[PDB]
Amino acid sequence: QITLKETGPTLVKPTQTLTLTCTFSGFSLSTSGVGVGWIRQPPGKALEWVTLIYWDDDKRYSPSLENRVTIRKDTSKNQVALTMTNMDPLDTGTYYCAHRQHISSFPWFDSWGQGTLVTVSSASTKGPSVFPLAPGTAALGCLVKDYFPEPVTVSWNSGALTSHTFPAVLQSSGLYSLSSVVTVPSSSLGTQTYICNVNHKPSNTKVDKKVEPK
């Protein structure tokens, strides 16, 4: 049926301009009753409508957000653009792009792109620092701290190891850190050596780290 594709800069610096583009197939932005919205949801927080534009270049705006957002239509391309000025870090979130149902009088979104992940942070791309988290089973892990451009790929013994990589929380310094951990036979400790393979493609910092008990 209908499909909507958000595109844009995954990452934008605070006080810069963000500009995203929903591209959409199933329907007609040139009809007399449809509209294309943006709803954004900061991670773990509740949905927040951001803007809507209708077939007659009427541009609805969330009141909280009106002074920064700028919405635009082109229905020759089947594209809507969303343009937010003076990016603030709280604006980090997923930006969904949605289709407003056109028969129904009060507005509601039936179609919703799997939305894009906008992250507004001020950090130069910096590689990770990868520290070891040493140990009828025991457990060991890697601590990848202070990586900035997420994501980080932690492999274990060359991904030859099969059994919990964690998500990243934004630190007090606008940098990210995530930690990967494995359960091995308690007997292999001090006999089978364990090395985690960490790659921060952003800075193409590749580092492997040997993790053993004291």
């Binding site: 919205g37 009141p63 007090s172």
Partner: protein, 210 residues
């Protein structure tokens, strides 16, 4: 600003019917919309215009309204329709306003967490910033992690990450302490307290500097 309320965290009996209220000024005259958002997914509309269902939403979901408080009732609850449920309406204030979500929780089985602690590496005690790690796994329900640095409560200084429901079990998390290398060299008792339902006693694994 306009606002319409819906409770956080309703809790249901699996296989029973559930009921979430959305209430806001003059809902009797606007029409009210209802969205299910499963974890990490984009929202899907479950009912619209008060009582209508999308082409593929099961008859179990229903919605109806009385006065300025509308409500979607999920009859014969399964465990997969456990999600964030948002309601939504038009106002004068904005075109579309969302109730802050309601987390339906389906329940019933109680697990327990294994607690490993990880001191800060000699690599990190050479940076000046040590970091202590407390990893729990396999617990369910999901909800309390304290830090005893020289037997003394440490609050306001840690962060936490977690994974979600495991593909098989449904039960995980990572607690992280930040001292400075002078705060590490000056306290001896280093512990991690843990609180959960399957736990009959508050768990703590401790370590000294050596």
């Amino acid at each position: 600003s306009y606002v319409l309320t819906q409770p956080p965290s309703v809790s249901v009996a699996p296989g029973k019917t559930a009921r979430i209220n959305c209430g806001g000024n003059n809902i009797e005259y606007r029409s009210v919309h209802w969205y299910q958002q499963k974890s990490g997914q984009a929202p899907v509309a479950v009912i619209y215009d008060n009582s209508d269902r999308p082409s593929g939403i099961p008859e179990r979901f229903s919605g109806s309204k009385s006065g300025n408080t509308a409500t979607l009732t999920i009859s014969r609850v399964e465990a997969g329709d456990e999600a964030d449920y948002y309601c939504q309406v038009w106002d004068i204030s904005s075109d579309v306003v969302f109730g802050g979500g309601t987390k339906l929780t389906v329940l019933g089985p109680k697990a327990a967490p294994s607690v490993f602690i990880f001191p800060p590496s000699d690599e990190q005690l050479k940076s000046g910033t040590a970091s202590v790690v407390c990893l729990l796994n396999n617990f369910y329900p999901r909800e309390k992690v304290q830090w005893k640095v020289d037997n003394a409560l440490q609050s306001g200084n840690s962060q936490e990450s977690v994974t979600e429901q495991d593909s098989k079990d449904s039960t995980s998390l990572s607690s992280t302490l930040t001292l400075s290398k002078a705060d590490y060299e000056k306290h001896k008792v280093y512990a991690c307290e843990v609180t959960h339902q399957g736990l009959s006693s508050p768990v703590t694994k401790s370590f000294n500097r050596g």
